[PDB]
Amino acid sequence: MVHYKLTYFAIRGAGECARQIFALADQEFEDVRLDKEQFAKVKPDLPFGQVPVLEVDGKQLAQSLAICRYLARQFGFAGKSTFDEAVVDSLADQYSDYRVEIKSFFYTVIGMREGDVEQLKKEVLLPARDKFFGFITKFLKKSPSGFLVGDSLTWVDLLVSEHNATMLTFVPEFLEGYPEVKEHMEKIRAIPKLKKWIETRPETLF
Amino acid sequence: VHYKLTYFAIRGAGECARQIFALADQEFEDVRLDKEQFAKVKPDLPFGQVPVLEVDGKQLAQSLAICRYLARQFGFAGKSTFDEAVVDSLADQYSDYRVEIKSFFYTVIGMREGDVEQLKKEVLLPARDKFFGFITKFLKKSPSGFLVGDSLTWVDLLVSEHNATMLTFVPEFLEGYPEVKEHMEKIRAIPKLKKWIETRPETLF
Ligand SMILES: N[C@@H](CCC(=O)N[C@@H](CS)C(=O)NCC(=O)O)C(=O)O
Numbered sequence: 406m407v408h409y410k411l412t413y414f415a416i417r418g419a420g421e422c423a424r425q426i427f428a429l430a431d432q433e434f435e436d437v438r439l440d441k442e443q444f445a446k447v448k449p450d451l452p453f454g455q456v457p458v459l460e461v462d463g464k465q466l467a468q469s470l471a472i473c474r475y476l477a478r479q480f481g482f483a484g485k486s487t488f489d490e491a492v493v494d495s496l497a498d499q500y501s502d503y504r505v506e507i508k509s510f511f512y513t514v515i516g517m518r519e520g521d522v523e524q525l526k527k528e529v530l531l532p533a534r535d536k537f538f539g540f541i542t543k544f545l546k547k548s549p550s551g552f553l554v555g556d557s558l559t560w561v562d563l564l565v566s567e568h569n570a571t572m573l574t575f576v577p578e579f580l581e582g583y584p585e586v587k588e589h590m591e592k593i594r595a596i597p598k599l600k601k602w603i604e605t606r607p608e609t610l611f
Numbered sequence: 612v613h614y615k616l617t618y619f620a621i622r623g624a625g626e627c628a629r630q631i632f633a634l635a636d637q638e639f640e641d642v643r644l645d646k647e648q649f650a651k652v653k654p655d656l657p658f659g660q661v662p663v664l665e666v667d668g669k670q671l672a673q674s675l676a677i678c679r680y681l682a683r684q685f686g687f688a689g690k691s692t693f694d695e696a697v698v699d700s701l702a703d704q705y706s707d708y709r710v711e712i713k714s715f716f717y718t719v720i721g722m723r724e725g726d727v728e729q730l731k732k733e734v735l736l737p738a739r740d741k742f743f744g745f746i747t748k749f750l751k752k753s754p755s756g757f758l759v760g761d762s763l764t765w766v767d768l769l770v771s772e773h774n775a776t777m778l779t780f781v782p783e784f785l786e787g788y789p790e791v792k793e794h795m796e797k798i799r800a801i802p803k804l805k806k807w808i809e810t811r812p813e814t815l816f
């Protein structure tokens with residue numbers, strides 16, 4: 406029996422996607438949530454001095470995309486071919502580039518950096534969202550099954566669902582002219598094992 | 612299988628995929644576009660952006676996804692899913708490192724204007740220190756020389772090409788880091804790679 410240990414801060418952020426995979430796979434795992442004092446003590450012995458970090462039977466593995474992709478492959482949420490897996494990878498990286506775009510706004514709301522909320526919303530967030538959902542909608546209208554790629558759940562379905570669900574907490578008007586994305590968020594998060602995890606995980610904002 | 616790579620007339624984020632095709636001895640259509648031509652094809656690309664790989668018609672965007680896909684097909688991904696995950700981790704850490712030095716990188720090559728000397732010492736070299744700190748760590752853990760496992764993986768290409776490119780603009784890049792310099796040499800000494808280096812279009816960056 407493989408023993409999985411996930412180490413990240415007491416928040417969903419970039420560690421949640423890995424957590425949702427463990428829930429969907431019905432896989433027991435050690436969910437370590439650290440504070441600023443405790444992270445400082447372990448930081449020097451982490452691959453890149455950063456979290457999330459996955460430990461598979463001792464072996465450390467950093468970087469959320471690499472963690473989620475690895476765990477997706479093991480439990481079969483990566484895609485049903487290497488090309489589909491590549492296309493799934495592409496949506497995940499496009500999502501990452503989209504997070505770089507809205508960093509300015511995202512860190513302001515939660516209060517990790519100083520900024521003006523209202524102009525960053527209309528001038529940075531919504532424009533990035535428009536462009537991003539434009540590509541997302543394009544994948545959904547190409548999909549008969551509902552999922553972002555192929556005819557089954559893949560780990561990027563989790564990434565995108567969780568982000569939109571999270572963003573609705575801060576910006577209620579996020580999915581207005583985009584019913585395909587809203588449908589998608591609902592479809593994914595309606596999955597009992599996922600919903601169960603949503604209902605019983607530590608209520609952190611973001 | 613017929614491979615078609617579409618990107619601008621430069622190495623940038625398309626080179627890694629190109630070096631894999633060379634190392635696999637694989638023929639491929641290397642399309643290099645200009646600003647007029649990109650505008651004409653842009654609307655029909657997955658995310659309106661290049662590089663884009665086409666495998667027998669099927670489009671695939673994003674350089675990391677392209678390089679990883681091509682690595683898996685020809686066997687430069689890693690010899691297990693975990694090793695592949697560790698290889699993925701170094702590639703993403705490299706990407707985060709490029710986000711750090713974007714301010715500096717675009718300034719030197721001249722895609723934007725900026726304060727060049729301060730950006731060097733206050734942004735570039737600090738990011739490099741931290742990054743090579745992790746890189747050296749992996750190299751001193753490696754008996755074979757390669758960044759991960761006992762054989763070449765696509766991140767060995769990414770890291771070699773970047774350091775070779777950066778020496779063009781900043782000659783003092785690899786001074787207190789012989790492990791990285793030796794790594795750059797080891798990778799770029801590989802005949803099929805060297806041959807590609809010697810016969811590819813000489814673009815700066
Ligand atoms: N691309 C990395 C980013 C990880 C990252 O930046 N983690 C942050 C979470 S806020 C961290 O470790 N922050 C502490 C610090 O280094 O200041 C990943 O997704 O794993």
Ligand SMILES: N[C@@H](CCC(=O)N[C@@H](CS)C(=O)NCC(=O)O)C(=O)O
Nearest residue numbers: 502624659660661662672673674675
């Ligand atoms: N995350 C992508 C980014 C690709 C990228 O930066 N593309 C730029 C190259 S300058 C581009 O397509 N620019 C023209 C445009 O999209 O307008 C990757 O590296 O795979």
